[PDB]
Amino acid sequence: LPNSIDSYTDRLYLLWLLLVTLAYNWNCCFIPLRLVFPYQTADNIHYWLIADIICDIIYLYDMLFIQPRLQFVRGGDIIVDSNELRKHYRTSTKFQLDVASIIPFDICYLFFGFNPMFRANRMLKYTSFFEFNHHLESIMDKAYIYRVIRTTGYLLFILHINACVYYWASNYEGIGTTRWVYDGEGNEYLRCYYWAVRTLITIGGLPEPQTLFEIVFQLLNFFSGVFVFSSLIGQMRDVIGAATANQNYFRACMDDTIAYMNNYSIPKLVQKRVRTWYEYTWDSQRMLDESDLLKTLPTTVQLALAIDVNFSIISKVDLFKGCDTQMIYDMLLRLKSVLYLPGDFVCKKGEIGKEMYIIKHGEVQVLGGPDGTKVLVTLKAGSVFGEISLLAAGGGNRRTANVVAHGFANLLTLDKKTLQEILVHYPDSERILMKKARVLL
Amino acid sequence: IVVDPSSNLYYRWLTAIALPVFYNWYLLICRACFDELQSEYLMLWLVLDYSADVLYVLDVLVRARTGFLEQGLMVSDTNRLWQHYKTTTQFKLDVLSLVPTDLAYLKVGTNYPEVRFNRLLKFSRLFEFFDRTETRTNYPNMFRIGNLVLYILIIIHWNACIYFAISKFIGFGTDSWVYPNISIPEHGRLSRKYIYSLYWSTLTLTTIGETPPPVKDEEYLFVVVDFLVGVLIFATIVGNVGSMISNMNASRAEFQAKIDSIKQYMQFRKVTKDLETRVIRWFDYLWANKKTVDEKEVLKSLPDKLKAEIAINVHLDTLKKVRIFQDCEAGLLVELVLKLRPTVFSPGDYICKKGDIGKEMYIINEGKLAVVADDGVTQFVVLSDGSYFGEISILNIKGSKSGNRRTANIRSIGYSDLFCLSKDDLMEALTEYPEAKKALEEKGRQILMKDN
Amino acid sequence: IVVDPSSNLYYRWLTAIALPVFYNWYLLICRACFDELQSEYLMLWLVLDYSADVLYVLDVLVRARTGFLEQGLMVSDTNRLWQHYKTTTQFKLDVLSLVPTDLAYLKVGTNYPEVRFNRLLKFSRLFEFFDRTETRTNYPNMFRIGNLVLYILIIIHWNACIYFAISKFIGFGTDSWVYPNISIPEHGRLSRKYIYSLYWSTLTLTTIGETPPPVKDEEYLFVVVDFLVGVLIFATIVGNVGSMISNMNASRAEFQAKIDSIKQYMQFRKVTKDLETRVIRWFDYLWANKKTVDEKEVLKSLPDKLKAEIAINVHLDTLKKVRIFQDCEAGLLVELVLKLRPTVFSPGDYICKKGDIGKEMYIINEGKLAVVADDGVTQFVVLSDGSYFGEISILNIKGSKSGNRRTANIRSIGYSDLFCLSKDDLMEALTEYPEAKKALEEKGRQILMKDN
Amino acid sequence: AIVVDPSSNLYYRWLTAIALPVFYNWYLLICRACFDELQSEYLMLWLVLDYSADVLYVLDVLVRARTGFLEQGLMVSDTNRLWQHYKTTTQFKLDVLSLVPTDLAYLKVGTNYPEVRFNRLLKFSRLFEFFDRTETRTNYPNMFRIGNLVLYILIIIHWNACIYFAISKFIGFGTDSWVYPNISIPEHGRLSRKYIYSLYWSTLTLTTIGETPPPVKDEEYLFVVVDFLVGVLIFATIVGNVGSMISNMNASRAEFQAKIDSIKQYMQFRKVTKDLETRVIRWFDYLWANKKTVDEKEVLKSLPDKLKAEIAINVHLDTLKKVRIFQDCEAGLLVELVLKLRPTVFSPGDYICKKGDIGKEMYIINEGKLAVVADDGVTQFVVLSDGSYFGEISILNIKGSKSGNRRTANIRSIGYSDLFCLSKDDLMEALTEYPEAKKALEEKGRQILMKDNL
Ligand SMILES: Nc1nc2c(ncn2[C@@H]2O[C@@H]3COP(=O)(O)O[C@H]3[C@H]2O)c(=O)[nH]1
Ligand SMILES: Nc1nc2c(ncn2[C@@H]2O[C@@H]3COP(=O)(O)O[C@H]3[C@H]2O)c(=O)[nH]1
Ligand SMILES: Nc1nc2c(ncn2[C@@H]2O[C@@H]3COP(=O)(O)O[C@H]3[C@H]2O)c(=O)[nH]1
Ligand SMILES: Nc1nc2c(ncn2[C@@H]2O[C@@H]3COP(=O)(O)O[C@H]3[C@H]2O)c(=O)[nH]1
Ligand SMILES: *[C@@H]1O[C@H](CO)[C@@H](O)[C@H](O)[C@H]1NC(C)=O
Ligand SMILES: *[C@@H]1O[C@H](CO)[C@@H](O)[C@H](O)[C@H]1NC(C)=O
Ligand SMILES: *[C@@H]1O[C@H](CO)[C@@H](O)[C@H](O)[C@H]1NC(C)=O
């Protein structure tokens, strides 16, 4: 075993949590079955004893050789050394539940006989079950399938507990005494699970209860079944409403744009271009805007997400080669993302120029022929054009030639006003930029 | 020829190939589980399976010809399309669904059509057709309700077929739970076979349960498994209808929350009853005329090119009729209609009185204003849709006797939708046009020499 | 006379035409399927059908003379109203609702009121009455459960009539599923027929299914279709009631989310217990006094004219008691009350201490403050509603011996609601008023030479 | 004169002590009115509990006629004005209708008909006030919503049980198959059997399960169809309340999971490198696991400016007073500077500021362990701990400084830090009201530069 388990990027710890989850689920399942049903006979008791020894050995191995070796964060930094990890486990709250679970009440097997009610302290180790469930929710790609799987598992466990309590009520009222109790014809657990399903799903068709304990049992079981069915419907509703939320929000905003354009009687070419933009934006980003996502993130992760996408591409530009890295970081933060349709003019010849464009995931074509349709150069993804317009002011430079988009080009647009509003903080880099404007102009 | 996957021809192909997939699922499970209609109409299922196999071969050679967006543009190389088709698992599912398994009919006697269950692997095409139809159509909630009815009909029919196959394996009429003895001429008909087995699955899957009870352990286990599958599926459908309804009335919930919050605020601050009646009639007009959304939020996420096309497709015919913007630059007119902001006025609400601060240029769209006098309401001129005012107050000519005091008494006749152009947005849009700014200043100077 | 749809007269006519449409739906399917109501009360249904047709031709005339909205103005020429009503499909639906199909009564002998099924086509008036009542009334959730009970009672009644029509087509007393033999005097009564058909359709559509099971193919198929319709009805009922409960407690859910988020922040940053229970008691006051929403968020959705009118009608009557704002201009008053800011102060909190920079001018609205003396309980002057403080330190008049410092300690006795008028807000409101800025400065210089 | 505060704890304890007998009066008055064996057998117990309920009701009138109400922010203590404000209230009319002495008619009918005592049910608004105050007081709001829903449907199911037993007593006992059986049989004639079977019947009816015998008479058919429509409405609001409970339970976890799915969609779009991808995912999982995932400018937005300033004092002022340049400054300047402090968090491996960077921020370390290293990598010079600070010199911008607002150090975050950032622009915006303290800060920074290097 290693001295420290990472418990985040470790699959062996997930396998061990699966093993302790199998042990705890074995306890919570097969303790009421052995408690109520007569399956713990005198010639099958050794199989249950070997399974209980394997279960308690898994519990003791988890308490003695794994749970001290979990890594954790106090004070911000990760703790590595085994003495402080052991002291963190010993002064934790999981160790109290573990040492309350592994109290050997099976010493009383010699006094009171083989009774599975004494093993009821072993179901107090639910922290490993909840930690494995949280780890599997965090490690699965899509969480709605595992929420449906967990809801089905809790439903089957509740129905198993209800079948066990119904077989206890049949043994308490006598097997085959009244018409409500279990009669003894076929498989006991199968017909009791049939009664538990047909009661706690609130289906009906069962024999009616005769005496007062049976009517009280049927009333409480049907009320708990109504609430379990309500919790199952509300759980599936919450899962579906959490799964389809981004799709429904995008469809509602597209319906808002289509209803506004139909309110203002905008023609079908512009409506087709808006629907084409919305369709490609949903097929590409799966979200409307990324600035309203990034503006809720903190500044350091905004800085890193700007750097690892565009810092090398802006560092290949010869204009900002001498400026400051913090000014480059500020223009990394103040980039604006646009998606240009095919056939669209990004910079018409003769129009005012005020923007610097970075092309990512697309191809543009500079229409500079004699008739105006002969392509000169196809600037692919990662190129930077129009960088010289960031230094002229007023009129300044005009766009030299028509440049159109070949396909769905996702340009990155930096304005001139945002560059000046960045440049009010950095006077030396502004001096470098204006002297570069003087030597290039 | 390369079919565009975003076109209409590809969607018509999706319909023409999503019909034999639904055919294959529905009628192959009934042909495999009943064996009473397969032995009656053999030529019809032979012709329909040959047509479905011809459509599946055409589906392979059309799915090997669809383009895909690689860096924004549609690729057209057929070798690249064939290699991109070969490297994915849908070609593996198609070549597994197009195995000639019908040669086993010569060994089995063609009385067992469950060897055609390899043809049920093309379910992604039917799911793609459902997703493309609920994308394309304008009734998405009604198509989701119809798709849930189709999914529960598929599940009801498959459960009915499974119950009849289990009843055939156990024996007809031997118990009380199973389908009765088919040598009796009442239960021996194919119509009562399918309709009673559909009735049993309708009672079982919807968790009603007034069928005859199971008497043996296999029937007990199947009814427990079938009740569990039915309660999970029908809880998923009830949660789906609940989430669809709570998404359908979400806009009405948000608008009623805004109306109730504003009404509680005006009940707290003791606003007078005439102003409260005016603002409640304004919100009732805003709800009943479907203007509940606003331009500043529905045009937030769009780029400046599409916002420019939307703005010049409504405002440019009015802005080109404006005298001071007659011969300016087209990019200046695009930026000027981008800087416009809508305002909605109630009838009887004053736009501006005599001596107020003038800094917005109002452009009238779908409304009617008029310049009234001081004391009474007389109509000097009535400005219609497509008219404008407020150019002097935003030009602010040095040497003027107006003094940023936009003249007149302008009040609203009806519910107007004014588009204002403020002074700050004009001086923001006019930084990159110095000679156009100077031309505006000399145009206002000629207006000043005309107005002495 | 031209009616307008937003008035009270159109809603009274919506009630008077939503009565016989609901009558036509309910009692026409009942008289069509039962054939004893039409036999017994023949004159009563003839009088009610004639009155429904009189209300239908009056509804045709009212919809011929109803007003619509173009260019913000109410349309008042009845010829254009007649053309705009006749050019749409509602005129075709009203003409199809008023085909003379009652002249087949002399053909069939009047025992067939199923020929009046064209009268059900005027359902837009009933849906419009439901939508206008949901807009108008102040119990929207109680009206929504009333609308839901009315819709499912209409479906329960229609299904009871469909079940009795199917039982009349098959036979009375020949099976166990059908209605029994109506020649028996217990099953032959009309009350027993209608209430047992209603009980049958409630057990079917309400997914409880205690009815005796079907015998034939038509009964099996009708029970399958009817139980699937009941599954969809239960899903619709659960979805509407769940979305209505979410809309009913969304405000409590968002206030509990804000309370637990601020509590999680306060145990995250480890604040003192006294400040924590001060924040807890302030949130308990803010929930128990219904001041939950924040007024700057409430006043965001309104337009600028209604915002200025509400800001006048709340703040100007208390602003004009301030003596330095006695003779300012109306636009300065409008933007001054538009740039105000209301805050609520806890008891015991110091508004301003002696020696702090005076950057805000506070006027008291529904509060009681007191000028204490240097961190003591002894109070010099107990301020009241309508008073002001902070006018000495905001203007920065030259010659000040104070130097922008509030010179008095002010404690809050109870919960006050001040109006925090900032120095920067007054300076930004004094940009377009240079002469009123100098007038305020000489007024402040005069009052500064008065006091100090 | 004693005045009870309606927002205090004594008023809530009185709300519990008066919401017990109203709820008792609801349950046991409809059960004693409908069952007619409880009223025959437990007569002394019901007279004692009804006398206790009437004593609590006149004490409730005496308390609600002395409680205060807020006007002008002040709690009024004048009992004559409190009595006038209670006298102009419809709740006083409901209380005097709830305390009508019907015991004369109750002894005229022989102390056997508690149907005359249905005026005691009029204090429903008091129990609703108790449930509102408990659902805004307690620490388990979802569990109290579940318990309140269970208690409301138990009231409705018990009232339907009493209504079904009254309909069976009116029609006849054992005359049909739908009604309650013949009570002359001593097994079906027990009171516990009566209440338990009638409660079980109304549970099976109002929760739409239906194991009941089918009705025979027309009034029985009409009561069963009305009761099934009420039952499907009750099942609808049960499923709606439990679904709203589950959504309000995991709304924050679902919002965080949708945020992580949006960040993963953005990183799959922009082709972000997998090391930074797992760094962002581990960062956000740490921020969720130690419960700081919501931005505090969005947390404290609903609070007013006075409470925001007091919270900013009580967190940051004892840490800002330890800074060397802000040791001797004004209290209002320190309150404005702790109001202007923004927090940023960091991950392991990131740089706070590098060598030669324009220093615009002053970082104050909290819950983190930074380190100043060299340029080549991890060579630690001085491990910086909690409570320390840096960047107080380069944001002062001392004229004639030989460094020239630089950093001259490479500072990495070893663990996760939660720094507090004070910008240069925020310091100049907070120093616009104190030019004397501005020149004092320039003097102190000039002193530090004179003892260090100039
Ligand atoms: N005209 C032109 N521009 C090019 C070419 N290759 C790269 N570019 C850049 O493309 C540009 C598009 O915008 P600009 O008109 O400002 O300036 C042009 C150049 O900087 C080329 O072959 N021709
Ligand atoms: N004063 C005035 N303005 C008019 C008249 N007819 C149209 N208008 C426009 O109405 C205006 C309203 O105020 P403005 O100050 O903007 O400028 C004025 C003109 O542009 C008219 O007869 N007199
Ligand atoms: N200095 C002072 N202010 C008083 C007195 N009585 C009432 N006030 C108000 O208390 C104030 C506190 O704030 P301001 O300096 O703004 O202005 C002062 C006055 O308006 C008094 O006796 N002295
Ligand atoms: N240069 C330097 N800065 C140190 C040292 N120990 C702590 N610090 C702080 O680290 C800093 C990082 O950059 P600063 O420019 O703000 O100022 C420096 C000091 O406040 C040290 O040994 N050298
Ligand atoms: C079905 O009926 C036929 C004759 O009616 C009989 O021979 C056969 O045994 C029956 N089947 C079963 C399973 O009993
Ligand atoms: C109904 O009853 C009458 C007389 O009792 C009888 O003539 C008729 O045949 C019965 N109907 C059926 C379907 O048996
Ligand atoms: C109830 O039972 C008694 C005896 O058991 C009998 O005399 C009486 O008639 C019965 N009453 C009814 C209504 O059945």
Residue numbers in the entry:
A (entry chain D): 206 to 646
B (entry chain A), C (entry chain B): 159 to 610
D (entry chain C): 158 to 611
Paper text:
Cyclic nucleotide-gated (CNG) channels transduce chemical signals into electrical signals in sensory receptors and neurons. They are activated by cGMP or cAMP, which bind to the cyclic nucleotide-binding domain (CNBD) to open a gate located 50-60 Å away in the central cavity. Here, we report structures of the cGMP-activated human cone photoreceptor CNGA3/CNGB3 channel in closed, intermediate, pre-open and open states in detergent or lipid nanodisc, all with fully bound cGMP. In eukaryotic CNG channels, the main activation gate is located in the central cavity and is formed by two hydrophobic amino acids in S6 (the cavity gate).
In this study, we first set out to solve the open-state structure of full-length A3/B3 in GDN in the presence of a saturating concentration (2–4 mM) of cGMP. All three structures show a heteromeric tetramer consisting of three A3 and one B3. The structure of GDN_cGMP_closed is virtually identical to that of apo A3/B3 in GDN (GDN_apo), as exemplified by A3L, with a root-mean-square deviation (r.m.s.d.) of 0.49 Å, indicating that GDN_cGMP_closed is indeed closed and has not undergone any of the gating-related conformational rearrangements. Strikingly, cGMP is bound to all four subunits, as illustrated by the robust cGMP densities in the well-characterized binding pockets in the CNBD. The other gate residue F392 of A3L has two projections (sideway projection and pore projection) with a similar occupancy in all three states. In contrast, F392 of A3D and A3R and F434 of B3 have only pore projection. R442 of B3, which projects to the pore and forms the arginine gate below the cavity gate, also has two orientations (up and down) along the ion conduction pathway.
